[PDB]
Design an enzyme around this catalytic site. Structure first.
Site, PDB file in Angstrom:
ATOM      1  CD  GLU A  13      -2.611  -1.300   2.602  1.00 36.64           C
ATOM      2  OE1 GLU A  13      -2.746  -0.282   3.309  1.00 36.64           O
ATOM      3  OE2 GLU A  13      -3.075  -2.403   2.937  1.00 36.64           O
ATOM      4  CB  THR A  18      -0.927   5.749  -6.879  1.00 37.86           C
ATOM      5  OG1 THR A  18      -1.764   4.962  -6.025  1.00 37.86           O
ATOM      6  CG2 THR A  18      -1.614   7.089  -7.126  1.00 37.86           C
ATOM      7  NE  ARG A 148      -5.012  -1.418  -1.719  1.00 34.60           N
ATOM      8  CZ  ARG A 148      -3.810  -1.933  -1.958  1.00 34.60           C
ATOM      9  NH1 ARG A 148      -2.982  -1.341  -2.818  1.00 34.60           N
ATOM     10  NH2 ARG A 148      -3.427  -3.025  -1.307  1.00 34.60           N
ATOM     11  CG  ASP A 170       3.205  -2.192 -10.971  1.00 29.98           C
ATOM     12  OD1 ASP A 170       2.954  -1.999 -12.174  1.00 29.98           O
ATOM     13  OD2 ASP A 170       2.376  -2.689 -10.183  1.00 29.98           O
ATOM     14  CD  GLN A 174       0.162  -6.373  -0.040  1.00 28.27           C
ATOM     15  OE1 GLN A 174      -0.252  -5.247   0.250  1.00 28.27           O
ATOM     16  NE2 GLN A 174       0.372  -6.757  -1.291  1.00 28.27           N
TER      17      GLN A 174
HETATM   18  N1  LIG Z   1      -3.584  10.832  -0.206  1.00 35.79           N
HETATM   19  C1  LIG Z   1      -2.752  10.035  -0.848  1.00 35.79           C
HETATM   20  N2  LIG Z   1      -3.176   8.827  -1.186  1.00 35.79           N
HETATM   21  C2  LIG Z   1      -2.226   8.108  -1.830  1.00 35.79           C
HETATM   22  C3  LIG Z   1      -0.946   8.505  -2.141  1.00 35.79           C
HETATM   23  N3  LIG Z   1      -0.261   7.487  -2.806  1.00 35.79           N
HETATM   24  C4  LIG Z   1      -1.153   6.545  -2.871  1.00 35.79           C
HETATM   25  N4  LIG Z   1      -2.365   6.827  -2.305  1.00 35.79           N
HETATM   26  C5  LIG Z   1      -3.550   5.968  -2.152  1.00 35.79           C
HETATM   27  O1  LIG Z   1      -3.236   4.863  -1.297  1.00 35.79           O
HETATM   28  C6  LIG Z   1      -3.815   3.654  -1.810  1.00 35.79           C
HETATM   29  C7  LIG Z   1      -2.765   2.576  -2.084  1.00 35.79           C
HETATM   30  O2  LIG Z   1      -1.939   2.922  -3.190  1.00 35.79           O
HETATM   31  P1  LIG Z   1      -1.496   1.822  -4.277  1.00 35.79           P
HETATM   32  O3  LIG Z   1      -0.804   2.540  -5.350  1.00 35.79           O
HETATM   33  O4  LIG Z   1      -2.590   0.884  -4.595  1.00 35.79           O
HETATM   34  O5  LIG Z   1      -0.402   1.046  -3.371  1.00 35.79           O
HETATM   35  P2  LIG Z   1       0.620  -0.104  -3.852  1.00 35.79           P
HETATM   36  O6  LIG Z   1       0.047  -1.311  -3.056  1.00 35.79           O
HETATM   37  O7  LIG Z   1       1.977   0.178  -3.334  1.00 35.79           O
HETATM   38  O8  LIG Z   1       0.431  -0.327  -5.279  1.00 35.79           O
HETATM   39  C8  LIG Z   1      -4.634   4.025  -3.036  1.00 35.79           C
HETATM   40  O9  LIG Z   1      -5.983   4.215  -2.606  1.00 35.79           O
HETATM   41  C9  LIG Z   1      -3.999   5.345  -3.486  1.00 35.79           C
HETATM   42  O10 LIG Z   1      -4.914   6.196  -4.182  1.00 35.79           O
HETATM   43  C10 LIG Z   1      -0.503   9.800  -1.770  1.00 35.79           C
HETATM   44  O11 LIG Z   1       0.595  10.306  -1.973  1.00 35.79           O
HETATM   45  N5  LIG Z   1      -1.478  10.509  -1.106  1.00 35.79           N
HETATM   46  F1  ALF Z   2      -0.813  -3.458  -1.805  1.00 36.67           F
HETATM   47 AL1  ALF Z   2       0.229  -3.355  -3.278  1.00 36.67          AL
HETATM   48  F2  ALF Z   2       1.277  -3.225  -4.710  1.00 36.67           F
HETATM   49  F3  ALF Z   2      -1.224  -3.336  -4.325  1.00 36.67           F
HETATM   50  F4  ALF Z   2       1.688  -3.371  -2.242  1.00 36.67           F
HETATM   51 CA   LIG Z   3      -0.173  -2.359  -6.370  1.00 35.56          CA
END
Ligand SMILES: Nc1nc2c(ncn2[C@@H]2O[C@H](COP(=O)(O)OP(=O)(O)O)[C@@H](O)[C@H]2O)c(=O)[nH]1
Ligand code: ALF
Ligand SMILES: [Ca+2]
Ligand SMILES: C[As](C)(=O)[O-]
Ligand SMILES: C[As](C)(=O)[O-]
Length: 318
Positions: A13, A18, A148, A170, A174
């Site tokens: 997360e 994003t 998300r 990417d 987890q």
């Molecule tokens: N407010 C805010 N929300 C963010 C930011 N970066 C990501 N998010 C939100 O946090 C959630 C998780 O991001 P995501 O890209 O799915 O995380 P990943 O699991 O690392 O791919 C999503 O709902 C995004 O819109 C940020 O800089 N600010």
């Molecule tokens: F929860 Al993710 F990439 F979707 F770390």
């Molecule tokens: Ca992701």
């Protein structure tokens, strides 16, 4: 011209997907109307799960409602949840969520979100529920960016920028997803490691006893000092600076780093966090890691920061 292999790494997360969406917006053709329509169900699901989490937390954290009438709403919302078609948001449901979101008890619980698991975009969607449920609603780019969906596999994003052909990959962050990472470590031109600044007072979903930031620090230590990356540019994105700016005024950084003596301010706390990550680089004598405070959901910010990253990649090729 030159092909650049980029890896987006980070714990669960943190904001990897994003940044990927931003690449589509900024370096590809953006989203088509039909593509946006596909996010409605996702957005409606996110909104439902968020309020459900807050409602659940009312009991968990023993927080009473401002108005007892909300209790009835909460219960019927719970039944509707396991009754509605997934991804939908019927008026009966919206009206209830609307009333709950306005409740002082619900709000107090919302403020204590670090004590349970809640979607980052909970406040964003819930506070804008009227627009979201307006008949004929179509997502805006920010709505899409705020959505998300937990991803697990590998996703390749290809685009051209400054005469470079990018192949950005990417993966899920987890613990369960990390075992497979090694398969993607060959011939990497640049690694963008994403760590959420606001994770300092959060615990992992995998282990509620583990602080999210300590986890990312451990992961970064493993990543930045990896054998496969000796000749790869490493950039750190200290993401969610917008969430961090608000959080730092309420939650003490000492929660994460007991030794921190400085003021719990955006600049001070942010720099301290930055130092904690960068100090893990045992190859500093031969390689410097550049970092940026980012807001993945902010297109202009991501646009700016990525431009600076491409410049570093280009320079390193001199
Ligand atoms: N407010 C805010 N929300 C963010 C930011 N970066 C990501 N998010 C939100 O946090 C959630 C998780 O991001 P995501 O890209 O799915 O995380 P990943 O699991 O690392 O791919 C999503 O709902 C995004 O819109 C940020 O800089 N600010
Ligand atoms: F929860 Al993710 F990439 F979707 F770390
Ligand atoms: Ca992701
Ligand atoms: C084209 As859509 C941002 O709906
Ligand atoms: C599992 As790989 C996109 O690193």
């Amino acid at each position: 011209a030159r092909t650049v292999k980029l890896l987006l790494l980070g714990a669960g997360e943190s904001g990897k997907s994003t940044i990927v969406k931003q690449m589509k917006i900024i370096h590809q053709d953006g989203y088509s109307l039909e593509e946006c329509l596909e996010f409605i169900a996702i957005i409606y699901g996110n909104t439902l799960q968020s309020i459900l989490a807050i409602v659940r937390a009312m009991t968990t954290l023993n927080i009473q409602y401002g108005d007892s009438a909300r209790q009835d709403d909460a219960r019927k919302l719970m039944h509707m949840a396991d009754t509605i078609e997934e991804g939908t948001m019927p008026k009966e449901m919206s009206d209830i969520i609307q009333r709950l979101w306005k409740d002082s008890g619900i709000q107090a619980c919302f403020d204590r979100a670090s004590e349970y698991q809640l979607n980052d975009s909970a406040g964003y969607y819930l506070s804008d529920l009227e627009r979201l449920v307006t008949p004929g609603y179509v997502p805006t780019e920010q709505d899409v960016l705020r959505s998300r969906v937990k991803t697990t596999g590998i996703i390749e994003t290809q685009f051209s920028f400054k005469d470079l052909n990018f192949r950005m990959f990417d993966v899920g962050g987890q613990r369960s997803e990390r075992k497979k990472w090694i398969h993607c470590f060959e011939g990497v031109t640049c690694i963008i490691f994403i760590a959420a600044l606001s994770a300092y007072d959060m615990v992992l979903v995998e282990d509620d006893e583990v602080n999210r930031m300590h986890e990312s620090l451990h992961l970064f230590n493993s990543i930045c000092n990896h054998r496969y990356f000796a000749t790869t540019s490493i950039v750190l994105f200290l993401n969610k600076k917008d969430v961090f700016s608000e959080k730092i005024k309420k939650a003490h950084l000492s929660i994460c780093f007991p030794d921190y003596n400085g003021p719990n301010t955006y600049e001070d706390a942010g720099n301290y966090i930055k130092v904690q990550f960068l100090e893990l680089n045992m190859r500093r004598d031969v390689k410097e890691i550049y970092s940026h405070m980012t807001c993945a959901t902010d297109t202009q910010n991501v646009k700016f920061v990525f431009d600076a990253v491409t410049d570093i990649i280009i320079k390193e090729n001199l």
